[PDB]
């Protein structure tokens, strides 16, 4: 690796990519954020992984949380630090005050502390050190100048010993100064900022490596989630554009359509189905799913508009029995409101379910539903994310999109995802003789030829029946054609 | 223990969903909010439910409000604490100052206080403790650093006694620091934020669990309302997408309509009637209510546009007698201006009326009326609300929508709810031979077949007469056809 | 007293509707706001209304203004305080400092005053007290901490005393902290905020009951005014949708029009005349107002576009004499530019005059003129106000609206009021053979059946003459027809 600085791996999903390999060894990383951002979690996970993956003893210095609590809280992610303390791989160095205390101590303690820590490190042959809430130590009565010396002194001796350190710091504003005293930022070798931005009553956690003296790294903010497994990062912009592509074809579930697509959809492709309410995107999805099961293949249907029940009532009405699909353990239906969590979550949920089910086909009914509230920029990042995972996973995926206006829609999508998709399937109403008839169309395909006709189609208990084109009409797209 | 972190239930409607079980046992939780946000209410309702639901004795430490008052006010919600005091189930520890104050009390009190609290905890075998305004205590002449210690101490000692406590703190900026000294947030293991956000002369009460060291919890803000039954929170993002579905139909009040819908509306469905003013949605709504009492069933009509008297005058003129409807106790008309309150409130009023009247059918005349002033995201949240609640209750609901523009409308809804609804009914004006005639169209029906025609219809004393389509016109969807 | 919180009416118009009863008895209510928000006025009008409505003596404690001025000023609203002081009903407890003095007199008088006050309370059998500018007292040299103690002592004492008080406080920002020391907020049992919101060089006073401990109240801000009869608040959200409705008919003033509305306008209804400039709204208004005089009924015409003198001319050129109308005291013209006062002030002026002339009919020439500048929500809130009052007052109302664009207007009103109105009349230009001809059209009626034809009409010295429809045309609504 062409980087001048030797790094250690956090083994924290996504972090090592963001930091181009992990935390510089022998240095210290300031990890700061507002309340409940995941600082303690980040540092504990840092020592944990260190012990489990590389047998690297760790020293956890705590200034506010009690050693029992640090061990009790860790059980939230099924981590047993008590077992590690007994094995002598983890040492929690208690430096929290006692509920009786006095006044004055943040100085010689800084010298006593260093000596304490050098003892633990030497005794336990420690390779990693995280210092949780150093902020609270000189949070006794100090100014910025006194803080710079004490921190620098701490960091400096830690570097002499050779310990790779992680120091947590608190902030009050999500975007203003990096840390409380506006001094930590510059004493540290590297700086990580954990945010938890509000905006729209939802909460989005992001991680940012602001600086790493010596090497490069990914810049900006990256979304993450805390789970029963700790921190989980998606470097959405680290996603390389090297997806495998094959000319393999797969049916859509509708024979006539497959012809229209010049032999069916591609396996390695993303399909977009757009049209106004009532056109039949939801239907098309059903048929897309069923076909994956009719060939003994798994498929997931992430529904964001219809209940699990309704999805069954309507599917049966179109024939195709979903009950059996789930029993045979070939079709897995999800279902959840887009307002039940921000995009990151939705993205992460979609991924796990893709891992705990090895789907060959996936269907997200209504991206345009996920687009509610969120800003366009946030949505497209979401669309690149789903769309990208699916691609690198040889997982054919059909996406749905309802257009904000029936008849007259000038754009295939109000979100402008169009270029992100390989094959687009357009549905639309046609006002013919006082009636609302449907018309299906294969607008585009990248590897195939595809039919260029705008066929009309009817929906029956049997399903979608693709008929013929309105040859004798003008302005079909307008929605209100003229008979010529 | 060798497991995660046990939680205690607060029985506060909604909160135990948001917290994934309730408050972390053996720990304290900082509940802070600006003036009048519900901090005290929350703390009394935490003790109260702990007594009345599990018989867990409670201690209430008060620092400003007098014990007599605290009991006086609880009456507001039909809470008799004085009774619980006598039964030794609840103990109100008066720590409030006397009208003849004295200097320096930042230590004697700290341990003298715990001494008392502990004494009380042991005496009444209290399981719950809630302290009101710990803020006021060091509001004598202290700085953040001194504040941090005192809380660290108060919090630490309570832990030792093993008390599951609720601590109240006051703010000053709805989105400024979480608490008065920007320190409390980091000392507490758990933090709850209660907000009374202004915005457009209206106030919206929300609740957020910023963090609970040790476990998971729903993130973000959640709207709640303080009623005669205390705090009521609506985790609008917790409602699952597991609504029950069936092929059971229900008439509309319009037989020709029922025909166009393939045999009537589904009971388990959401219908939406859109069109310009004058087309006839308020009509379709009455014709809906009636049909619910002719089959001796109970229905509620939430009107926000026309008064109660008018709804009657116009209903009689269409025939159907609303008078009898009410007497027979099968029909209940509410009526109230959308400006009379905020969305959160309206949503609740809708629900409580559904509970006290066991409705079969429900209709909201003009969702678009409720969309006045309020942002779009707030509205959809409302629509998802009243919509899913109905869906899961087996309630057949009809929702009215008045598109901003007569003729030319390119979208069924300006708000864009058309995708959350099951069946869409479209009314529109059609300029014919210098005349303004109507038309009706069953735009979409998820489970049924429904008529695809745009039938013209007249309105008389008898009601709505759905005639034929204009099979000899072009561009009818535009309002100004072209005879051919 | 083991009952809910009992309140005491302030008799301040509107306040008792918002506060669900009035100020809670025996408790102190904080009332703060920026300079000149009506603070003093409030407390004072609180002690007055008491003396004159329930003969409850009152004690007024002033710390800055002199008793002479407090009385001299009250004269601004026709309140002879001087008299009430004599009749021992009101006692003004001067507590203002003199041009000379000393210092180091902190809580010294705070204790002495709580006596002087108790004195006058018993001495005059006082039930209501009001302390104007408590803030100015510790505005000598205190910190937030010293302020919280002094206020708690005072409030506590007055509470023991059993007095129902109103304490005045000053703010510096309309939307920042509640009171100067951000401490009063929490010390008070009730907090009311008076705001004098600037915004576009226009000032809008609003009052808000932030909290009332132990009881319910209306949330949010509320516009109010300061007139010669004291504070006047309009609970526009409190107005119920319980308006009386009848099938009585009345005449538009245009026979042919009445026929079209199927027998005329309903007495209990609101008519909206919509059209581009020149169409003729001011004509219908003229005609509508004249008709109420022909039947010796009183009617008011609130003109916001044309002057008194001009209305006369143009109306005499149409026949109808407005001169006699006024002599016969059957017609009352108003006239004022919308720019001569905020919506709040207009709405009131509209109401006051309706009370000083018992109108049976009402005409507002150009709602769209009142819509100038003001935001859309602030407008609808004015429409609903005027619309409602008229409605519950059995007064027939005709409101005019000029659409922003002539020909092609795709919406009746730009402000969207159309769903707030019972009867919609639509005037429009029709380009036929290179000439601009008119057309009248009864868009909708909630009771009657009305005509659906779009009839062209012409204006002469006789007034409006409704002719025929354009049966042989196409795209009339558009304004640029096509003959078939
Ligand atoms: N199993 C879990 N799943 C999801 N979230 C969790 C889980 N366990 C803890 N959390 C969340 O992790 C956060 C706890 O923060 P954490 O313990 O990482 O330290 P911190 O927020 O950085 O600092 P502080 O000590 O000031 O709270 C909380 O927001 C909490 O809800
Ligand atoms: N049994 C059936 N027989 C005939 N037509 C049906 C039947 N079921 C559904 N349909 C038709 O299909 C439409 C249902 O739309 P569908 O579920 O396919 O998804 P969509 O229109 O793409 O998206 P959305 O959920 O927004 O409606 C109805 O509007 C209706 O015309
Ligand atoms: N029965 C009730 N129904 C509706 N709202 C009520 C009722 N009783 C009280 N309220 C409202 O509840 C709020 C009272 O807040 P509460 O006393 O619980 O705590 P706080 O204001 O956050 O803190 P503190 O009381 O110590 O100042 C006020 O907004 C009040 O008007
Ligand atoms: N007795 C009647 N006979 C014939 N037509 C009537 C009668 N009453 C009302 N109408 C017609 O019905 C329409 C009334 O509309 P309705 O009250 O049904 O609700 P809407 O148009 O959907 O919404 P809103 O009128 O509140 O804006 C009028 O436009 C009118 O043409
Ligand atoms: N007759 C009146 N008509 C219209 N406005 C009036 C009349 N009398 C007084 N006002 C207005 O009323 C307000 C008087 O405010 P007031 O003295 O009651 O309280 P304040 O200014 O809020 O606080 P403080 O007087 O303690 O400084 C001013 O804005 C003034 O212009
Ligand atoms: N004596 C008259 N003879 C013929 N037509 C007249 C006469 N007076 C006015 N008109 C016509 O009536 C129109 C006057 O409009 P009017 O006063 O009725 O109000 P408006 O058109 O509704 O609103 P606005 O004030 O914006 O013009 C003129 O544009 C003109 O065509
Ligand atoms: Mg934190
Ligand atoms: Mg921490
Ligand atoms: Mg769908
Ligand atoms: Mg309280
Ligand atoms: Mg309407
Ligand atoms: Mg209506
Ligand atoms: Mg849709
Ligand atoms: Mg002033
Ligand atoms: Mg308070
Ligand atoms: Mg005019």
Numbering used by the authors:
A (entry chain F), B (entry chain A), C (entry chain B): 14 to 497
Q: What's written in the study?
A:
To analyze the phosphorylation patterns of KaiC P-site mutants and to visualize potential conformational variations in the vicinity of bound ATP and residues 432 and 431 at hexamer subunit interfaces, we determined crystal structures of the S. elongatus KaiC single mutants T432A (TSa), S431A (TaT), S431D (TdT), and T426N (nST) and the double mutants T426A/T432A (aSa) and S431A/T432E (Tae). b KaiC mutations xyz or mutants KaiCxyz are sequentially shown in order of sites x = 426, y = 431, and z = 432 where the wild-type residue is in upper case and mutated residues are shown in lower case, i.e. Tsa or KaiCTSa, where the residue at position 426 is T, the residue at position 431 is S, and the residue at position 432 is mutated to A. Interestingly, in the structure of KaiCTSa, A432 has moved closer to the γ-phosphate group of ATP: average distance 5.6 Å vs. 8.2 Å (wt-KaiC). One may have expected the above KaiCTSa mutant to represent the state before dephosphorylation of the second P-site (pS431). Instead its structure is more representative of the initial phosphorylation event. The combined structural data expose subtle changes in the orientations of the H423-I433 loop region harboring phosphorylated residues relative to the γ-phosphate of ATP compared with the structure of wt-KaiC.
The circadian clock of the cyanobacterium Synechococcus elongatus can be reconstituted in vitro by three proteins, KaiA, KaiB and KaiC. Homo-hexameric KaiC displays kinase, phosphatase and ATPase activities; KaiA enhances KaiC phosphorylation and KaiB antagonizes KaiA. The crystal structure of KaiC from S. elongatus revealed a hexamer in the shape of a double doughnut with approximate dimensions 100×100 Å, whereby the N-terminal CI and C-terminal CII halves of subunits are joined by a 15-amino acid linker. Two phosphorylation sites (P-sites), T432 and S431 that are both located in the CII half were identified in KaiC.
